[PDB]
Design a binder for this molecule. Structure first.
Ligand SMILES: Nc1ncnc2c1ncn2[C@@H]1O[C@H](COP(=O)(O)OP(=O)(O)O)[C@@H](O)[C@H]1O
Ligand SMILES: [Mg+2]
Lengths: 359, 283, 274
């Protein structure tokens, strides 16, 4: 019953192997004025605690607070002893190599788990979809990636990184909302302006035609119940927020959108694998829930690929937790028993596994 | 058009032949030339030299091994020499024919040294390469024994449209007073997917370390070689990663200083004079 | 009759760039009958000439030549003076005068040097144009490279709407070398050619040459980034694939287990299939 404990910049996930849903999903945020206030209790007492994020942009910056998060994960959320059974962990691609083992040594120094299979986040989402070959988008909370995978191997020379993610979109939505008249100020009112983003945002094909229709006919208006008794009618930002991914010049970044980088991902690859890689582009992450985001990609790529072949783009319904399930279907498998980063290797070789078993 | 001019023109064409493919260039130089009878012998030395320089491998008739061809290591006559198994062979420059089942006789003066060289080079030629082949030769030049260690690796693929080759050679001398190490490296890669890209690189290194006995002599040059190669890869990767801001900005910038597209309307279509007095008085 | 010229073109792309002009000489030694027509096919590095009346250099080309007599873009002249018609389309004269000025202001913002030239044509319905840019390596700087680029522009007629279809073809030659002590000598070369077509309106605020400058600058930026990232990029992949930086006995120990893992996963995915 292996533990899958998927880290993340927004919301940390933890659970057992046999289940098909993450049992413990809680925010990864640490407050300071007791000192051990992490998670929902940290959010509740916002009037005294100076909240701060340990993880930033997919690379662990502060290490003590990440240790506190790991301690809270294995004590209150799961209520199990650390060393009962192996634990699996994940880290984003394009990381400092020493940071892979910097967490291994602090894990053994306080938990001494029986084994590890520290792996990439994107290599297993493709397995969760159900295949071994394809392109993957880690459109998450801190960063976005384009990562091709062929036969289970991650090519380090063919990945791309984008800074645009959910938090920038939420900040932009706040900026647009200030202009209408309903001013939202300070960080306490973030959790509600995120809520408008979840269930009142979508994408449109004709960005200009949609703007013309919204400005002319006031049928694209929706009412939202704030938790005060007030009701806010919201109009034209229902498509001006998610379009920032396809045109980053709105915020100011000169980087390309997430629709040209899927092209550069596969230009930097062999001739013979492209027929395989167009056929299966797999979505993932928390920031790809919006309705109709498959159709915009299907229309944009067809205008930029050769017209002599077929592009099929797919997405499961359970895109948000696809990293967790893909771990749990890999941790519990028949021939998986023999290749772990087991404890006896560290016990025999002493502090030498940190530069030997890097595979 | 003088005939011998044409012959030597084909000779220096094939001398600078592209990275690895020989059949297409051979067919086309056959096409341009009319006197194939003169091509048989007036281009034999050029094709032979191309085989000598490239360090090509050849798979022998079923002794479960393949061997390289070295300019400084082969026998030199029509029939060449091998390090292992004591069987000289005749290798055709064009048809890759296998013949000459006639052994020969080694000097035997320092066979332990060359055997240890083979055994040590083998160990860090297998694991540290993805796919490569090596050879080691020993010969007496000017009354002094010299050991030449040669390494070659190729990744030929026509359908993907790229070619690549690594070649390297190292010299070792027998001087109990003080040893000396000479090394030469070269890289050749070619990419032609709807374009042209060539990359040629060469390097030479001179270094040395203390002498040692037979139990230890198989390790010092191996360590020197591995250190030199690793530092070379570090150097080329470090220089390549900073291409867009160190060496490539001299030819052309990515964007101008303004970090924006040039505004052609204002380019198509005195404040500075007056502002100088303000700049003087204030500062 | 037609295969030999294709074979000559095949030979042309095969040789390295840094001495191709010598090969061009060698080319005219091999087959004299096809010496003229191949020059119209194969792009060549361009030559630099000097104007005597203004004291500045310009760029020789193929399509500003008639009877072995060239024209300077700045001062209308020929080596045989007043023996043939020179620089037609006086209404286009002004549209050269700005243009010869205009693109050198573009030289000053990107290259910080180099030499440029533009020559326009006449044709039945509209006009055409040929634009040249050359940049040589700096003498003081250790790096010694060369950039050449040729552009051909065509515009079709339109009866009304003030919308013009510009067709732009472009070709770039690039050569770079480094001689740093750490890595010895390294050389890089490149040749590329592309086309595109675009429709855009004609306005008093935005004349034709503004659009031509837009297309030229966009093509050059796109080709620069494309050649840097996609083409030159995976040479690093090939050289790092020839040998790994670290020793790898470890992956070979578990490679057979990886193959068995792939086999059983391929079985299992079909086994459940959601
Ligand atoms: N239903 C939803 N619709 C749209 N966006 C959502 C939804 N739920 C969460 N998000 C966004 O996704 C983010 C969470 O991303 P996540 O998948 O946790 O990234 P990571 O796991 O890499 O940290 C949140 O910050 C939020 O902005
Ligand atoms: Mg995530």
């Amino acid at each position: 019953t292996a533990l899958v404990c998927d880290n993340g910049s927004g919301l940390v996930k933890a659970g057992f192997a046999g289940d098909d849903a993450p049992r413990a999903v809680f925010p990864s945020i640490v407050g300071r004025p007791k000192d051990s206030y992490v998670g929902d209790e940290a959010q509740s007492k916002r009037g005294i605690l100076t909240l701060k994020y340990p993880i930033e942009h997919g690379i662990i910056t502060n290490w003590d607070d990440m240790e506190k998060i790991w301690h809270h994960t294995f004590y209150n959320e799961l209520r199990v002893a650390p060393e009962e059974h192996p634990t699996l962990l994940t880290e984003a691609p394009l990381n400092p190599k020493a940071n892979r083992e910097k967490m291994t040594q602090i894990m053994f120094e306080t938990f001494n788990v029986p084994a590890m299979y520290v792996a990439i986040q994107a290599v297993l989402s493709l397995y969760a979809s159900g295949r071994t070959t394809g392109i993957v988008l880690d459109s998450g909370d801190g960063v976005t990636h384009n990562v091709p995978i062929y036969e289970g191997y991650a090519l380090p020379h063919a990945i791309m990184r984008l800074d645009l993610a959910g938090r920038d979109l939420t900040d932009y939505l706040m900026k647009i909302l200030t202009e209408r008249g309903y001013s939202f100020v300070t960080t306490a009112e973030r959790e509600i302006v995120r809520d408008i983003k979840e269930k009142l945002c979508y994408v449109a094909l004709d960005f200009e035609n949609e703007m013309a229709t919204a400005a002319s006919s006031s049928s694209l208006e929706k009412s939202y119940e704030l938790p005060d008794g007030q009701v806010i009618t919201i109009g034209n930002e229902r498509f001006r927020c998610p379009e920032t991914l396809f045109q980053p010049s709105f915020i100011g970044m000169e980087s390309a959108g997430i629709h040209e980088t899927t092209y550069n991902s596969i230009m930097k690859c062999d001739i013979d694998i492209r027929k395989d890689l167009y056929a299966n582009n797999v979505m993932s992450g928390g920031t790809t829930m919006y309705p109709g985001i498959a159709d915009r990609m299907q229309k944009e790529i067809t205008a930029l690929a050769p017209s002599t072949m077929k592009i099929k783009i797919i997405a499961p319904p359970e895109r948000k937790y696809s990293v967790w399930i893909g771990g749990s279907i890999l941790a519990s498998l028949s021939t998986f028993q023999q290749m772990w980063i087991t404890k006896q290797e560290y016990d025999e070789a002493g502090p030498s596994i940190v530069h030997r078993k890097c595979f | 058009v003088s005939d011998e001019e044409k012959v030597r023109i084909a000779a220096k064409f094939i001398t600078h032949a592209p990275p690895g493919e020989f059949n297409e260039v051979f067919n086309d130089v056959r096409l341009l030339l009319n006197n194939d009878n003169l091509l048989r012998e007036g281009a034999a030395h050029a094709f032979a030299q191309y085989n000598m320089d490239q360090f090509t491998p050849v798979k022998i008739e079923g002794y479960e091994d393949q061997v390289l061809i070295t300019e400084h290591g082969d026998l030199g006559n029509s029939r060449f020499l091998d390090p292992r198994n004591k069987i000289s062979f005749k290798f055709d420059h064009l048809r890759k024919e296998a013949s000459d089942p006639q052994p020969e006789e080694a000097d035997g003066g320092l066979k332990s040294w060359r055997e240890s060289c083979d055994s040590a080079l083998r160990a860090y030629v297998k694991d540290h390469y993805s796919n490569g082949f090596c050879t080691v030769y020993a010969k007496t030049i000017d009354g002094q024994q010299t050991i030449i260690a040669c390494i070659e690796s190729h990744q030929f693929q026509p359908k993907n449209f790229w070619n690549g080759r690594w070649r390297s050679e190292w010299k070792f001398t027998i001087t109990p007073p003080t040893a000396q190490v000479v090394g030469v490296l070269k890289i050749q890669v070619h990419y032609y997917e709807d374009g042209n890209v060539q990359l040629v690189s060469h390097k030479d290194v001179q270094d040395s370390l203390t002498v040692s006995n037979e139990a230890q002599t198989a390790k010092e040059f191996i360590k020197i070689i591995e250190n030199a190669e690793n530092e070379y890869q570090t150097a080329i990767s470090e220089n390549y990663q900073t291409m867009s801001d160190t060496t490539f900005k001299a030819l052309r910038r990515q964007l101008p200083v303004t970090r924006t597209k040039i505004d052609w309307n204002k380019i198509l279509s005195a404040l500075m004079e007056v502002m100088q007095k303000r700049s003087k008085a204030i500062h | 009759s037609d295969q030999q010229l294709d074979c000559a073109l095949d030979l042309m792309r095969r040789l390295p760039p840094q001495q191709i002009e010598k090969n061009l000489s060698d080319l005219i030694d091999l087959v004299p009958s096809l010496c003229e027509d191949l020059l119209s096919s194969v792009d060549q590095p361009l030559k630099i000439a000097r104007d005597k009346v203004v004291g500045k250099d310009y760029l020789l080309c193929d399509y500003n030549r008639d009877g072995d007599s060239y024209r300077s873009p700045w001062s209308n002249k020929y080596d045989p003076p007043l023996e043939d018609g020179a620089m037609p389309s006086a209404r286009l004269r002004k549209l050269e005068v700005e243009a010869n000025n205009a693109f050198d202001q573009y030289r000053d913002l990107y290259f910080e040097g180099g030499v440029s030239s533009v020559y326009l044509w006449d044709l039945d319905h509209g006009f055409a144009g040929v634009i040249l840019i050359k940049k040589a390596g700096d003498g003081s700087k250790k790096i010694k490279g060369c950039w050449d680029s040729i552009h051909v522009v065509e515009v079709q007629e339109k009866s009304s709407g003030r919308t013009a279809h510009y067709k732009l073809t472009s070709t770039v030659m690039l050569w770079l070398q480094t001689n740093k002590s750490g890595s010895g000598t390294m050389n890089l070369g490149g040749s590329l050619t592309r086309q595109m077509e675009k429709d855009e309106t004609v306005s008093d605020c935005s004349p034709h040459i503004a659009n031509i400058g837009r297309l030229v600058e966009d093509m050059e930026n796109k080709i620069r980034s494309t050649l840097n990232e996609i083409y030159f990029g995976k040479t690093k992949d090939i050289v790092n694939g020839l040998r790994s930086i670290d020793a790898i006995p470890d992956n070979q120990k578990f490679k057979q287990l990886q193959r068995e893992l792939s086999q059983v996963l391929t079985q299992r995915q079909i086994g459940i299939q959601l």
